[PDB]
């Protein structure tokens, strides 16, 4: 590995200019040769160290000139040239003055600003060569920060708004550091990266990019192949699909090795994701490229291929069905014979396809897919479950599918295998599950789905409760509460109160959930009020900072319902009770209180306010000093409503 012995040309390869190799003796060199043998031998021998008591020059260097903001102990290696104070005697003075970088990296924000401009206007002067030579090591640094990274990205942008023909030799030398930005956990890092590669490719020439980036296609590591694929995606967004087509179409037919074709196909995909809706014109040519990989002897190429078809169709949302046409008949056939991930991938593709077919052809074809779809619910693969999930959305969310068939065949296994505590803890699986369940409700109706998932409101874990809660929310949002019967409605309101009574974190899902449930139920909720508001007051105490704000907001969103049903005692309650909390010292609570008052003002009118405005308003007036935000917001709002 990295410990493999080296050669003197390889030795001259690493270190920069201006250093000498030394023998001191031939004898000390023979000590260095015996040192290996003596690393074992002399370590097994007499040795020790000691110190004597005796009375006692101390040179050192920070970065002095006037100021020179501080150097981390490692960064010395980069900035050492600045440390020496030799000054005032060509290019060496341009590298020396280029340490303004250091002012960009570390220092006060003003130093970073002024430095940044000063180096922007010196672009044309210094040229890209010295800059990148003195930058790319820093942006390559193993100790690099988050901020420092981002800032060096900024300077690379700002200098690349100017330099155009100049960067041609450095393009690859740039991308090598930049392509790792495309695959990252941070999103803003990704949009930045795509931006600066856009500026680079458009900045340089097409042939510059192409001729540059070929050798990374067959590179042994797949990492560079992947991030390189996303690179071609970005540059293709820059210079357009048709310009870059013949390159690709040449790549996917390369007869050398498969890895290339794998890369190029991945490129087709990432183009599909990036360009998205705008793929539309060249969709045909793209398909005509990719189609030849589905039948290939290698597996990967097949998998990633069909996946790329998926991405296409998903950005192809319905149009261009016949362009996918010739692709189908193999795919369906493959649907029969496959085991493992490739199968699921095909299911992904076909899944996004079906909405694009005709309800007659897609009738047959769909009815065929449903079987395998059923059988495959049970696989432990989470990739599997994602795919087959979204599939069930598209297949069974089709207007040309019959309710009763779903009600019988699907729902029982669906709620059996899919609703479990493996899913909800994950993020994507959470969301997608929510959506699919929402759509199944959109077809089979409301009372079914809800009726089966109500009992889970009372389940122990939060995240699960959160999941079924937001599900009920969206469902009753779309279909309406009219379908719901009586008993299941009792289980509803009790479920929602119960779940709402235990809140580990502060979040809207439970609240918006409750509000939507009630406003959807309309005045069918009336018998349930006293239980509600009893809970609302008792919770309205509890232990302060957590739940006060939340119960308050609950009032705020339940105002209109507590109004139209004409419970006036309740308005007395909320009016003077909330009136009393206006002396609460915790701002985050008080804000929610004022909000609740606001919502109560928009239901019961001016002259009917149980806390007559003469009381209220001057009691509000002193609060305006309150600094912290939410108070000022809601307060000024309410003073606005009443003042208006």
């Amino acid at each position: 590995e990295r410990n493999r012995p080296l050669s003197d040309e390889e030795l001259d390869a690493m270190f920069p200019e201006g250093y000498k190799v030394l023998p001191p003796p031939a004898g000390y060199v023979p000590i260095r040769t015996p040192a290996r043998k003596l690393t074992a031998t002399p370590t097994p021998l007499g040795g020790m160290t000691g110190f004597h008591m005796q009375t006692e020059m101390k040179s050192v260097n920070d970065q002095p000139s006037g100021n020179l903001p501080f150097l981390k102990p490692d960064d010395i290696q980069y900035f050492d040239k600045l440390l020496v104070d030799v000054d005032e005697s060509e290019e060496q003075k341009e590298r020396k003055i280029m340490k303004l970088l250091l002012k960009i990296k570390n220092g006060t924000p003003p130093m970073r600003k002024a430095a940044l401009r000063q180096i922007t206007d010196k672009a044309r002067e210094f040229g890209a060569g010295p800059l990148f030579n003195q930058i790319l090591p820093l942006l390559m640094s193993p100790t690099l920060e988050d901020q420092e990274r981002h800032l060096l990205v900024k300077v690379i942008d700002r200098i690349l708004y100017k330099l155009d023909d100049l960067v041609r030799p450095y393009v690859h030398k740039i991308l090598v550091v930049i392509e790792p930005l495309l695959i990252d956990e941070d999103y803003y890092a990704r949009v930045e990266g795509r931006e600066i590669i856009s500026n680079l490719a458009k900045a340089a020439g097409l042939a510059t990019m192409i001729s540059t980036m070929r050798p990374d296609i067959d590179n042994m590591d797949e990492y560079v192949r992947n991030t390189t694929a996303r690179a071609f995606a970005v540059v293709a967004s820059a210079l357009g699909i048709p310009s870059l087509l013949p390159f690709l179409k040449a790549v996917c037919k390369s007869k050398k090795s498969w890895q290339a074709r794998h890369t190029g196909i991945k490129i087709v995909q990432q183009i599909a994701i990036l360009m998205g809706c705008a793929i539309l014109p060249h969709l045909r040519s793209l398909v005509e490229i990719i189609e030849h990989g589905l039948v290939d002897e290698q597996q990967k190429v097949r998998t990633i291929s069909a996946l790329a078809i998926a991405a296409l169709a998903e950005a192809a949302t319905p149009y261009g069905i016949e362009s996918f046409d010739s692709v189908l008949k193999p795919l369906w056939k493959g649907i029969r014979q496959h085991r493992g991930k490739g199968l699921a991938a095909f299911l992904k593709a076909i899944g996004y396809l079906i909405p694009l077919m005709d309800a007659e052809y897609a009738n047959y074809y769909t009815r065929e897919v449903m079987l395998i779809l059923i059988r495959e619910f049970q696989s432990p693969d989470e990739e599997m479950k994602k795919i087959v999930l979204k599939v069930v959305k598209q297949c069974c969310g089709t207007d040309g599918v019959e309710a009763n068939y779903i009600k019988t065949e699907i729902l029982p296994p669906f709620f059996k295998h899919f609703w479990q505590h493996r899913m909800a803890l994950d993020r994507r699986n959470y969301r997608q599950l929510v959506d699919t369940t929402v759509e199944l409700a959109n077809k089979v109706g409301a009372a079914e789905i809800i009726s089966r998932i109500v009992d889970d409101l009372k389940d122990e874990a939060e995240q699960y409760r959160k999941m079924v809660m937001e599900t009920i929310e969206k469902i009753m949002g779309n279909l309406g509460a009219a379908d719901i019967d009586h008993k299941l409605e009792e289980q509803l309101i009790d479920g929602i109160l119960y779940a709402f009574q235990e809140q580990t974190t502060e979040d809207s899902v439970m609240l918006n959930g409750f509000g939507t449930v009630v406003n959807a139920l309309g005045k069918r909720v009336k018998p349930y009020l006293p239980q509600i508001c009893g809970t609302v007051l008792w919770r309205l105490n509890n232990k302060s900072a957590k739940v006060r704000q939340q119960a308050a907001d609950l009032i705020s969103r339940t105002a209109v319902v507590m109004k139209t049903c004409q419970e006036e005692k309740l308005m007395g309650h909320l009016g003077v009770v909330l009136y009393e909390y206006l002396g609460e010292e915790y701002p985050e609570v008080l804000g929610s209180i004022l909000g609740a008052l606001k919502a109560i003002v928009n239901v019961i009118g001016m002259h009917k306010m149980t806390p007559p405005i003469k009381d209220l308003l001057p009691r509000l007036t002193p609060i305006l000093k309150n600094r912290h935000e939410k108070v000022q917001e809601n307060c000024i709002d309410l003073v606005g409503r009443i003042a208006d």
């Binding site: 009992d455 009372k458 009792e490 289980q491 009790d494 119960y498």
Partner: protein, 124 residues
């Protein structure tokens, strides 16, 4: 369930051994009133009695879980800490509700809080 209170070994034994009509006193709260309110001790009491009334010996499993758990002669029920009391209370609620729903063929995760409170506390 003041009847099941005589299922306890001490009371039933005392009565069956009694040779004359006589008034005897007991404290069913033991020392609880030190750490808790009266009424809450009353809820704990009802839980204990009812639970003795339904599954009997299994409630005794809850109340006599570990042989290192002891009961003092001055007291009717074993000495426990507040954490321990909350746990055994949950277990007793579990006994009552589980068997009620087992008799009435009801899924007892579906019952309400009002229903549960009624079932435990008395006749609905």
């Amino acid at each position: 369930p003041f009847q099941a209170c005589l299922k306890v070994e001490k009371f039933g034994d005392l009565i069956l051994k009694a040779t004359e009509p006589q008034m005897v006193l007991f404290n069913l709260y033991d020392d609880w009133l030190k750490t808790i309110s009266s009424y809450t001790a009353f809820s704990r009491l009802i839980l204990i009695l009812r639970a003795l009334h339904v599954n009997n010996d299994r409630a005794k499993v809850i109340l006599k879980p570990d042989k290192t758990t002891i009961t003092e002669p001055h007291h009717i029920w074993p000495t426990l800490t507040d954490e321990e009391w909350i746990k055994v209370e949950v277990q007793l609620k579990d006994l009552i509700l589980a068997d009620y729903g087992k008799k009435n063929n009801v899924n007892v995760a579906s019952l309400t809080q009002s229903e549960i409170r009624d079932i435990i506390l008395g006749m609905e």
